[PDB]
Amino acid sequence: VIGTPWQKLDRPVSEEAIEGMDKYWRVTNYMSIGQIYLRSNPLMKEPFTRDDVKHRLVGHWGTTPGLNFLLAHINRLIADHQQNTVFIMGPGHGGPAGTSQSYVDGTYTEYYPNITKDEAGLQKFFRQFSYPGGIPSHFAPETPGSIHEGGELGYALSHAYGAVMNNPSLFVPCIIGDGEAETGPLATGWQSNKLVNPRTDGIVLPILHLNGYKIANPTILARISDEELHDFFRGMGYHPYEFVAGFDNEDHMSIHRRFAELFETIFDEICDIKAAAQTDDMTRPFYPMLIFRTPKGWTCPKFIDGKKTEGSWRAHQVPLASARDTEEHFEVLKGWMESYKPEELFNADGSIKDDVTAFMPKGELRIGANPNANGGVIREDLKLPELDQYEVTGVKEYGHGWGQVEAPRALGAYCRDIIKNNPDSFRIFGPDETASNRLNATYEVTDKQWDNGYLSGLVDEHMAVTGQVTEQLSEHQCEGFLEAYLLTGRHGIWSSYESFVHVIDSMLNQHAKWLEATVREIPWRKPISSVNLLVSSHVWRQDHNGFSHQDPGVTSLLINKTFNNDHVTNIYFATDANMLLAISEKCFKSTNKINAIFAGKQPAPTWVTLDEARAELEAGAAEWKWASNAENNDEVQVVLASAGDVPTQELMAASDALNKMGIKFKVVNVVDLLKLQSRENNDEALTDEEFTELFTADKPVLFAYHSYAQDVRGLIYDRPNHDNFHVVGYKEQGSTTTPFDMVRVNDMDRYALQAAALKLIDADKYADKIDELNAFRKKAFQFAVDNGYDIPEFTDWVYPDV
Amino acid sequence: VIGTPWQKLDRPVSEEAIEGMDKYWRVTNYMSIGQIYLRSNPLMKEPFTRDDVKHRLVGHWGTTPGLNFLLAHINRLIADHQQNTVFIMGPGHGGPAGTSQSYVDGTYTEYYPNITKDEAGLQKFFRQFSYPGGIPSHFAPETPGSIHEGGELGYALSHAYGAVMNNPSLFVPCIIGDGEAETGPLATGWQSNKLVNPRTDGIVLPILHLNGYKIANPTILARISDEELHDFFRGMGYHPYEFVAGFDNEDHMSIHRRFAELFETIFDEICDIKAAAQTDDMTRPFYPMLIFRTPKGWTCPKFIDGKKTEGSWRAHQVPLASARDTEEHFEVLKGWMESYKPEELFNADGSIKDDVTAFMPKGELRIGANPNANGGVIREDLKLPELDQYEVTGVKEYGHGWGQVEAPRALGAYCRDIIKNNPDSFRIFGPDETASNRLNATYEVTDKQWDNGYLSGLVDEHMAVTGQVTEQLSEHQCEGFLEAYLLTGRHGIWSSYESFVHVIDSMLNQHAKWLEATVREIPWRKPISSVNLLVSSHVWRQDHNGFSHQDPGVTSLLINKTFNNDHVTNIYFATDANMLLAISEKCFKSTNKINAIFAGKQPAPTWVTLDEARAELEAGAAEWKWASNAENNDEVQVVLASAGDVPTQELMAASDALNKMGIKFKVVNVVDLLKLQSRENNDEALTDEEFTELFTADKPVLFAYHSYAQDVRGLIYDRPNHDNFHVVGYKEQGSTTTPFDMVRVNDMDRYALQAAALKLIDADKYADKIDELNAFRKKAFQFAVDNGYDIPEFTDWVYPDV
């Protein structure tokens, strides 16, 4: 248990705490300006001149003094209440507030011993910000106290609410830009309070950083009427409180006392909600939120060159852009740094004075030290059930290609038992698709968590105010909740229709970037559990939907995060349920990855046993010898290679036909896609020798690929024999139609695969047979048109091993 | 002018109109069930049996009777008020409501003559829905009256509000799923009413289709308290009205009269707002919105197999899934179809009776016929200014590589004058980045349109309640507004930081799919203007930001929509401002495309004259002979090829060094990326002969690519000499740093490009020189570390032609 969660003070904030908060705010403002502007001389010792100013002024001042103000008050609150707290910096371009916070709390020097608490350390701290060989502009994973960089705006609230799930002692004050709140993902993020429970989860306090402006415009929320703004927050289930400061001559000590009093009222309300929830955990409370309305750039010069800067979008990036080049900008910068009176904040040796930090929290309550902001220090491996009990044993009892299994049901049973064994640290998210993607065996041990109105057991099934599945029709919510759940040390999976995974392409990019920086150069940030995404209801079998639901292209995006041997991204094609099981075990053990797990949910053959699945997965691609009819690679006339359940089924049927014609071939299944890249691009891929062994040195290879052929073509560009691969992938064809028709129109069906294999082998010799196969595809299509279902010869085919 | 816009009735809805609306609702419900369930016998003529039921039951009943109800009332409103109207079907899986609407209004038979108004036509209409060789499950572009398919949910409101921009006579009732409203893009879509003007734009009426459920869950909005729901809509600037029906025994005629009365109150309020806006166009009104709360699946069987179906998520997809296989489901289906009393709705010949449609609008007011729902019939070519006046003439006067131009400023001036010449049909959208991406010369002739509070001319600049630029910090808004603006026949452009274009990857996918279906098989849907996206502030020069802002990967997504010779996607690399001008002219003339226009906004050399730009763009890739020093291709030791402003600059400097060493090479610039594909994949690409002429038959080619190397590798897979290309692209390296450092760490800098060219030519011979270049890159990096700016030898280099 960290601290004493949810305790009220029952006395006023002390005057010593007010004095310390004002010094915090002045020293963090001063050092934020130092990080942006100063390459040397951080205490302005004589002579302080333009030569001390950075040659390239980069950074964002506008948000920063508002963040520094809130962080003074959040620090005071954590110390007085001993409250387990992680904050979210929505405007993550306010990096200097976050580095300053860590430098003040002592964690920065603890993690970065060269950046010491004295004048030499402070000089290095100023220079390094946004500087070559230094540190980032944003609140990056290398900053103690960050679980959210806030570079690509919009995810502040999903991360805040995922952090508090199953974390009942955790308080998250979530600072949201008012520009940020105009994004789609942030606007739906407010609604998360219908999906958390005040007893079993922790508490988010949204703080709208309503500074009136984004980059070059006012914000929507800052210019609507007060009555609309309050109605908006009340309508989303909050009790809105509003603070307004900095727009008149009120002295800063008075402002601190008024804010401290308000923040105590708000926290007392949060403690009352927490206490009440021990008895009534079914009534959704109106959680407080805070409208924090202060001038953008607060405390910078009001006008610069006759233009209003404090209280304007003009304060957004770097005021006084000429501070190094003109004595006029320099004199302004000097007056501004001096206005904080650093001679009262730092000792002669350059260390921040003790009376600046006596009010601060200590130990693991510090924002920089709390282990929820470095959740791999809290993370424990899952207690996983034995995989063998889930195996589809039909392959062993009856043969390769047996049965009509819906593959994700086996993952569902495995998930059900993982939740049983790990009942408060493994969650499933879904955008109203958990049952549709066949993971609903989980409901046998838990419910979907819904903290909003109930009506009747005639409609409400498998839903309760607490549970370990969460659904909302938003891929951004599901991805953001899960990411923060992992970042705070827990585990999970989500599932999406494949075409709609693209809604969160950019979130996958940012989380991959977080992982890249971490595996490269942040070894104190310990490994977290991986994002596991079941990519299902795929391009080939969207029976009730049509062409909008046909886009397997998240493969292509994921390929753009496969560099430097970071190994933070995996693309797996689950050939059947036994393979899905073997892939899911590996993913649930893995850390510091995004794992995209492709599996069809339609009834489909099972090809491999679980033991075979375990070996083949490890290799990445495997010959299926029981399906090949060639002696050795020299006898092979063509290599039949597939990735994905549907291409494999069609390839298998084509193999059966090619066997009966007396054609010699081998069958290769590909599960771990990026293991096709060369060793030069991927030090864990198949070696050239293993790659040649599978694909031959010079035989043609027909490769039936689940997604866009482009992906495989680009991955295998420097591989031996790559000029002989003919990759058949999805090619933007299809509609609402029968299963045969969907493969037919992308040349993916068994008949077209058999034809392509014959064309690769000898086009002239097989000219007639190819015509005949192409005519059968027309006949089969006409059959479907006339009759309403596919031709029995297609649907009724079972691999001859069965 | 279509109809008589914004006219009140000032009498009650007639009883004849109520009777006609009830018959509409019954016949469209009946035919919706017919489309889902029936392969033959649409009038249930003796014998009606299981054999008439489809073998594959696919489709979505739950949303559909609510849509059919609203469409009866929207049709009545259009007819009585003669109101120019396009609706948006948010729940686009209710395709049968949209096809039924067109079949009733007569447009379906007008566009599809085989689907006649009689029993034979009705049989074909039922069978074809969601059927092989038939039509889609959703409200697809092939349905008259659609500008929004609603497959990937969330974009209903951005499309509605973009439709009404500069369209002051247009009314858009926008039907939003209540599941849909849990998405991010929909949640921010409500806020658009701060960005439209009630005088110069038309009016959206959001209708929340609050049927209580999504697929397998209730919805957030349906289960919060009524007071929260109303406060929510009032807080977003609406006057909420709520209708509740279908939950008790109220007869359907009574329900129609109550709704008609309410819908007249709402429309009268919209007419009052429109009238008032002729005098006060600065006060933002509270626009009506409608909460429409009815049971999901309304009018289907209340219970099926003991499970509540009407008023449940269970009604979502296909009730009575056994209707063909069991007499029990069949008897239920039969009673349900009979409950609509089709013997009163159709004549003996199977035509829908005249008294079913006497209340309907006629001519171009019909929802299926209105030209705003087929805007290429309204679209006129832009009156474009002459391009030559914008040319950067520095190249002609001083030489190739001259000056420090910020390329998008020339596009800004060109846009400024396009708006001048087309002052109400060309708009610019930006997610608070218009000025940041340097398109702010447009503000010389128009303002950013902002219909929310003003404070002071000290902060409000270039903003007014009407104008042709719109900004909101949401890529989903900018993309959705623009798409509908084009779909209703107008023109525009938007700009985004390149990394954040990924927020709307999935919207680009859907619009590409809309374009694919249209160019393939919908010739009555005439061409619309293209989506033009300035992709700027790119990976190499995000000076104030860092690694979160470094992701040029939208190239890779766009490559997945380049099939079948649809030619609906273009990727252009603007080498400099003259090239950007030549690309922008072509894009502004083009139709039925998405055009991604890559240009850097940093100060940069101009390489080509405008006449050269015009020729090279047409070819797609061009030798720059004035930069090559080889005689012919046989003399070439290496081909120096680049795409993108920054790779080209570095390649050019490498060429200068390689020239001074006595190395023989040619320079090739690539502008129109997909023209590198083979003719087999792209019938408008470079032929093999032209490709060999540029890239040689067998010399090494160093290709410095703006984005991920993977893209170029996969595109050129079947090209002559492709095994000799070495593609250098962005490889997930970089941070907040100097311009040299960002290229350095991706091996993209001039020194590394010169080294790679030497390695390709003779690794042994040049071993020492390569070491030396690699050491200079270290020295240059250390310089930046020590000094705060890049080494003068790097920054000060100008191409020797200047």
Ligand SMILES: CC(=O)c1sc(CCOP(=O)(O)OP(=O)(O)O)c(C)[n+]1Cc1cnc(C)nc1N
């Ligand atoms: C850094 C960057 O690229 C910023 S900061 C910013 C304004 C944010 O204003 P906000 O009111 O949220 O913050 P504050 O006033 O500074 O506190 C924008 C549009 N951008 C570009 C941008 C665009 N779109 C998205 C999704 N994310 C980002 N970061």
Ligand SMILES: CC(=O)c1sc(CCOP(=O)(O)OP(=O)(O)O)c(C)[n+]1Cc1cnc(C)nc1N
């Ligand atoms: C068709 C499909 O793939 C549907 S329909 C649906 C429920 C929509 O409920 P809503 O309340 O909006 O509509 P209604 O009750 O039927 O009127 C979902 C989750 N899906 C999957 C889905 C997921 N995510 C996104 C972005 N879009 C879609 N279409």
Ligand SMILES: [Mg+2]
């Ligand atoms: Mg702001």
Ligand SMILES: [Mg+2]
């Ligand atoms: Mg609904």
Ligand code: NA
């Ligand atoms: Na090759």
